[PDB]
Design a protein around this ligand. Structure first.
Ligand SMILES: OC[C@@H]1C[C@@H]2CCC[C@@H]2N1c1ncnc2[nH]ccc12
Length: 167
């Protein structure tokens, strides 16, 4: 039993809700919140910019130190950093950016990072400003993640479409 509320169950291990991941994180304070990061951990907009804003830029400060030490992430890769006032931890995951010419096959690799955590609050990777199809992304999530994932879908129209076409 966990403190997530109002989610639809999609499969044995995937749950979805029409919600802003930032608001879900503030309310639930989960163990792991996923960020839809880029390789530079430059949290400008979308999921990342909104999460970072909610941390009063502490996420960006921590991220800049991480990059100065370790260099950029790989597309498809991740790192675990603090969750600040939103969660215990933040799993920064880089999906491929199709508007950069990056291979959509790396989306499966991106979701594989979720399997290192028993329970996560997450967005749909590569959706939004990353340019990918959110229905394809939801299917990759369902077919890749085996741990318990609670998906927050920001756009109501998209949520309705994902749920109705899922079977
Ligand atoms: O797939 C990520 C979706 C696509 C949307 C268009 C751009 C970013 C948006 N995303 C969000 N998803 C969940 N919570 C969110 N809070 C703020 C943004 C946001």
């Amino acid at each position: 039993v966990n403190s997530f509320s109002g989610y639809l169950k999609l499969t044995d291990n995937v749950y979805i809700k029409n919600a802003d991941i930032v608001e879900e994180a503030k309310k639930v304070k989960p163990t792991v919140v996923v960020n839809a990061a880029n390789v530079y951990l430059k949290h400008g907009g979308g999921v990342a910019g909104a999460l970072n804003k909610a941390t009063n830029n502490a996420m960006q400060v921590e991220s800049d130190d991480y990059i100065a030490t370790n260099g950029p992430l790989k597309v498809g890769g991740s790192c675990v950093l603090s969750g600040h006032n939103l969660a215990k931890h933040c799993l920064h995951v880089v999906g491929p950016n199709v508007n950069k010419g990056e291979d959509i096959q790396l989306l499966k690799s991106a979701y594989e990072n979720f399997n290192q955590h028993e329970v996560l609050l997450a967005p749909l990777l590569s959706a939004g400003i990353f340019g990918a199809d959110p229905i394809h992304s939801l299917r990759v999530c369902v077919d890749t993640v085996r741990t318990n994932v609670y998906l927050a879908v920001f756009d109501k129209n998209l949520y309705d479409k994902l749920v109705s076409s899922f079977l």
